[PDB]
Amino acid sequence: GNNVVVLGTQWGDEGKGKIVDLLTERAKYVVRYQGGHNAGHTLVINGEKTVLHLIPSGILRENVTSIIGNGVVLSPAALMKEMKELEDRGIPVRERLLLSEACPLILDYHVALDNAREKARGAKAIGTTGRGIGPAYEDKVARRGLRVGDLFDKETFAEKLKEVMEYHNFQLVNYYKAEAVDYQKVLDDTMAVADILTSMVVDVSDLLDQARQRGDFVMFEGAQGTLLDIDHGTYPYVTSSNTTAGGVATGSGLGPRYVDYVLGILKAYSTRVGAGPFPTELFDETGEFLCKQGNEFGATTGRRRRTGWLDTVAVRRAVQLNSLSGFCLTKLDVLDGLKEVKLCVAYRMPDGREVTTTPLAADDWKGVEPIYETMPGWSESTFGVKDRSGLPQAALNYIKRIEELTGVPIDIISTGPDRTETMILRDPFDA
Amino acid sequence: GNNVVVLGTQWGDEGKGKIVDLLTERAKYVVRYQGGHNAGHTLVINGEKTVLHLIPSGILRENVTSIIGNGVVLSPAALMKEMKELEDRGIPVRERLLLSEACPLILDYHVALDNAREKARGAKAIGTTGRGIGPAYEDKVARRGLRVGDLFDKETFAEKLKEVMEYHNFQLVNYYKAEAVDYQKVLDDTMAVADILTSMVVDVSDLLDQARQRGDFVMFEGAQGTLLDIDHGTYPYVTSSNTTAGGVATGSGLGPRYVDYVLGILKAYSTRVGAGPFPTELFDETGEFLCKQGNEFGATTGRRRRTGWLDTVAVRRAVQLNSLSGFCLTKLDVLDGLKEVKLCVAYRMPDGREVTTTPLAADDWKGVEPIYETMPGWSESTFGVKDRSGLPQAALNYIKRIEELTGVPIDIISTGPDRTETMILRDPFDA
Numbered sequence A, B: 001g002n003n004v005v006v007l008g009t010q011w012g013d014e015g016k017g018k019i020v021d022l023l024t025e026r027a028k029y030v031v032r033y034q035g036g037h038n039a040g041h042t043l044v045i046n047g048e049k050t051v052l053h054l055i056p057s058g059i060l061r062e063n064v065t066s067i068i069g070n071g072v073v074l075s076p077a078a079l080m081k082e083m084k085e086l087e088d089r090g091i092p093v094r095e096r097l098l099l100s101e102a103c104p105l106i107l108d109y110h111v112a113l114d115n116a117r118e119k120a121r122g123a124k125a126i127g128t129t130g131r132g133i134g135p136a137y138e139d140k141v142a143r144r145g146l147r148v149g150d151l152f153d154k155e156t157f158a159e160k161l162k163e164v165m166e167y168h169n170f171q172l173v174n175y176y177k178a179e180a181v182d183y184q185k186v187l188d189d190t191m192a193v194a195d196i197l198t199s200m201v202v203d204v205s206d207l208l209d210q211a212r213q214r215g216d217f218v219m220f221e222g223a224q225g226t227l228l229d230i231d232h233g234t235y236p237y238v239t240s241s242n243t244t245a246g247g248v249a250t251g252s253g254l255g256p257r258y259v260d261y262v263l264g265i266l267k268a269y270s271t272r273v274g275a276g277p278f279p280t281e282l283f284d285e286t287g288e289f290l291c292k293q294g295n296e297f298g299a300t301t302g303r304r305r306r307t308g309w310l311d312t313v314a315v316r317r318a319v320q321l322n323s324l325s326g327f328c329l330t331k332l333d334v335l336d337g338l339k340e341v342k343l344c345v346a347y348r349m350p351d352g353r354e355v356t357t358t359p360l361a362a363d364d365w366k367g368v369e370p371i372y373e374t375m376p377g378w379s380e381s382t383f384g385v386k387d388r389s390g391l392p393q394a395a396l397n398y399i400k401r402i403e404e405l406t407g408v409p410i411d412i413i414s415t416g417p418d419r420t421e422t423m424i425l426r427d428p429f430d431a
């Protein structure tokens, strides 16, 4: 399919950046349909790293026009930050990148708010990345926010800005007893980058309609993961946007009927950053082993990531939700050395029932325990293996049972962080 | 296609209820994927009216399970209100209707907030329906809201409720100098309907996955219209959810790849309720004629609706956005008697350019004027005509040029408010 969707089947941090960069070879466009700079999509070409946060993972490819769609909450400061960094490394970000005038803006006050609300939660803190994501999405739905296109008239912007900040500060100071963030300062910072963004502005939905009509290879890149969906996730321990493929047509403008292949990025084991349910969570050396080996530390915050065995149940939901066409198995080599391996095949409900369906809101997950199928590990090395013939029978079996369990094929297998340390058993643009 | 989407191509009030009720004949399920009780979907069977607001338009059909998906913001009070009304007329609402535990709740404080913010806008008021829609969607994205599933434990609910209201009231009283809405009262009202909703709760996304796998006829019903989309609409004069087909997979849980046919409901002329851009707006007898004849008055508020000629440009956007498979032409008989007819074929930009693409945010629409193609009307009557042979050549021509202009076929033509006063030139479930 020309229009391929690559998204996180778990809780984010499955390894999407690498796959977007990988598959972008034949693509003319890469589009982010949601999230913000809360992400940390890491690219490694020949061993040279690049951590992307807001910038689409097709930024290091001459042929690709990277696009930040309307669904995405844009932080002027972060964008400017990333560009220079890439520009200093030979990537003409401004010739490659495009953005929607529809994109919500994230400003100083959104972070202050993001932090007050979090603190306000005491023990019940979500573990948000503290980037004003939550608040930015709020102001939007409220029809009170600033989008990219408001910079079109700096006069009315400053007026609109004064009004909105006037409002937020009363709450910051008067309710949260927090300091007020200054209007003139945020104004000054904003209006100093205004001209840049506005020049990257294009009609994204009309744009993609033309590519589709011509048959161009479009790649929509997701951030976060299925279980962090604002609707379908473990509410309220979720992100503020829709991380399920449906957010593709809403935050890009593409016809829902034009999505061709939904590629699910599946890490060989689970991880979570931020508070929230996680059945297959391990608190033993096996879980610490995964931490040290998969190098599970937040790429935006640097927070230690919680680890666990693969959960085919939370995954099976992701499957149905995104109409996944196939999987890309990431970090399988992190399993090397393990004796026994475990996938979660079902959940034991607190009332004694056994189910193969996940609960919904965070509360509903309470006494839910995991049922596993233990499998033999493999001492052999898997790192860098670019073919199955090099994958040991166990590894191969683990993979197959996963397909069997989910009914979805492991189309690509990633055996290392570098672009080349991978296997494409089926190409999404082909099949 | 089994999975048919029926949505508003304009600004809502195109006549969706009637088409949902119409086409539901072979459907097992009807799903609302967004909106709230801000809608007013009117059904007329043999001349008997039923105004639906939150209840899906497949509620008067024995064979159909009506579903209110997770995208929908649910007002406990409105639901209870509608049910009794239908129950008093022989519709066993509780045996027919199902709802998602994921659904956001709308309470007293959301309306108070909705009204303060509106007032707060002075002249720049949006013209919201004042049903707490805006605020309900806000609390959700904020991860501070109450969803249906919180009623699962009334103890923690009351606690969660106390906290949220505690917060809103400080702003109502302290900022907006408005009265505080009482916690115990809202608690009392809520907990008095708690058991009803919770018994209609089902797993909607898992549910629809099974129907899809079996090949059931599913009907997703939209509310509002394409130009009221929170992202793609005339921001901030929009609604707080996504009225484009992409909101189908996000507020239902259906795989974006499972939508089969997007049916666009197109009224023969335009209308708008609430503030906002409307190029083809008429302020002359022709525009008043349409008002009196199409009986254009808000079905939720009873507000006089603004009228205008058909705008193929605002429509052409809707087309691309929703990947429309076809159109259903509504209210064509309202045109009877007119001498000349006019469709908007392009816009004259304020800088002198001529475009066939619509601007985005409300501001961007400023000096935008419409370019028309005038056509001969028809004195003949069109009301009740169930076939083309009865449609006069002019009418027929108006229809064809519309297809030509948009590149999408008028699959169904509605010649009156009653279920039977229609024409299905192509059935969506068939083709």
Ligand SMILES: O=c1[nH]cnc2c1ncn2[C@@H]1O[C@H](COP(=O)(O)O)[C@@H](O)[C@H]1O
Residues within 6 Å of the ligand: A011, A012, A013, A038, A039, A040, A126, A127, A128, A129, A130, A131, A133, A134, A223, A224, A228, A237, A238, A239, A240, A273, A274, A275
């Ligand atoms: O890209 C990400 N990867 C993993 N977790 C994330 C990512 N972005 C946000 N989160 C989680 O999203 C939740 C809410 O934070 P938000 O994105 O800051 O609004 C917390 O559990 C965050 O850790």
Ligand SMILES: O=c1[nH]cnc2c1ncn2[C@@H]1O[C@H](COP(=O)(O)O)[C@@H](O)[C@H]1O
Residues within 6 Å of the ligand: B011, B012, B013, B038, B039, B040, B126, B127, B128, B129, B130, B131, B133, B134, B223, B224, B228, B237, B238, B239, B240, B273, B274, B275
């Ligand atoms: O179903 C509807 N039909 C037509 N206009 C609507 C409908 N629902 C909301 N609106 C418009 O939506 C805008 C914002 O109001 P909201 O839906 O109250 O949040 C105003 O222009 C409303 O008139």
Ligand SMILES: O=CN(O)CC(=O)O
Residues within 6 Å of the ligand: A013, A038, A039, A040, A041, A129, A273, A297, A298, A299, A300, A301, A302, A303
């Ligand atoms: O790659 C992104 N991170 O792991 C999320 C974070 O640091 O919060």
Ligand SMILES: O=CN(O)CC(=O)O
Residues within 6 Å of the ligand: B013, B038, B039, B040, B041, B129, B273, B297, B298, B299, B300, B301, B302, B303
């Ligand atoms: O049918 C719904 N109305 O026209 C909207 C309203 O009354 O605001």
